[PDB]
Design a protein around this ligand. Structure first.
Ligand SMILES: [Zn+2]
Length: 274
């Protein structure tokens, strides 16, 4: 007899049968998908920046309290992201999307990442549900612009260093990134969702619908801790739709899915998307 496990199947063959006949694939992604591009995640070494956990600084009170510190933090991340490049897991998702579109089959990417590496990969049908490290939003007027400038403002040049006893830059509020609209000159915030802030209503509305129409769901490189994203694949599996996790470890959501493929997703995902 089998001893009870809450580890789903690892049978690639059985998954690839579902993949062969699937018309609307929803692929959900977290930081794990960029791990092999050399971009740190929230669990390992990159969970910490100076004396804070990354989640501590991605908060409205943090910005309210020390806008300069929070801008240092996001400036560090923008600069780290700059060099990095799509790994074979990103590109396989783009290729899969390309190929299957010609046969009228849809592949939608719903990413928690704010690194735009799916866009740089060639993926086209993408919801960035937590915004983007390379967009600004104005605190007064609300303009969302892309912004890939190194550095976003001269005052941040050479700053944002991660070490815990690094000297604070204490940039005055007027010398932080400012809205380029003359006659507003408001303080910019990065255009990302912070813990305690609602996701964009139209994006989420659209994502719910994509999830309702999907007949197969992939969940790659996410810890499934941050809600609401964490409950997406769970809700799909609540409709009897097969879900397959691609992760180095188990998550508290793995239990609810049909398949689970342990390992670095740059290796496990491309053979599953062929
Ligand atoms: Zn403005």
């Amino acid at each position: 007899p089998f001893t009870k496990m809450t580890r789903p199947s690892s049978d690639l063959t059985a998954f690839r049968e579902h993949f062969a006949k699937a018309k609307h694939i929803a692929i959900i992604t977290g930081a794990g998908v960029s791990a092999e591009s050399g971009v740190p995640t929230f669990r390992g070494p990159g969970g910490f920046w100076r004396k804070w956990q990354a989640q501590d600084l991605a908060t409205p009170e943090a910005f309210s309290r020390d806008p300069s510190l929070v801008w240092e933090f996001y400036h560090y991340r923008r600069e780290v992201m700059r060099s990095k490049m799509p790994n074979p897991a990103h590109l396989a998702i783009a290729e899969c999307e390309a190929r299957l579109g010609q046969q009228g089959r849809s592949v939608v990417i719903i990413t928690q990442n704010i690194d735009e590496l799916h866009h740089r990969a060639g993926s086209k049908h993408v919801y960035e549900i937590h915004g983007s490290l390379f967009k600004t939003r104005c605190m007064s007027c609300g303009e969302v612009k892309a912004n890939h400038k190194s550095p976003i403002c001269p005052a941040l040049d050479g700053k944002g260093a991660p070490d815990p006893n690094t000297k604070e830059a204490r940039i005055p509020v007027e010398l932080l990134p400012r809205c380029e609209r003359k006659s507003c000159n408001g303080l910019l915030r990065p255009h990302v969702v912070w813990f305690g802030e609602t996701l964009d209503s139209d994006i989420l509305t659209a994502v719910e619908r994509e999830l309702e129409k999907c007949d197969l769901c992939l969940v790659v490189g996410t810890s499934s801790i941050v809600y609401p994203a964490a409950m997406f694949a769970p809700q799909v599996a609540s409709r009897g739709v097969p879900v397959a996790e691609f992760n180095m470890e188990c998550t508290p959501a793995t239990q609810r899915f049909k398949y689970h493929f342990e390992g670095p997703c740059g290796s496990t995902l491309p053979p599953a998307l062929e």
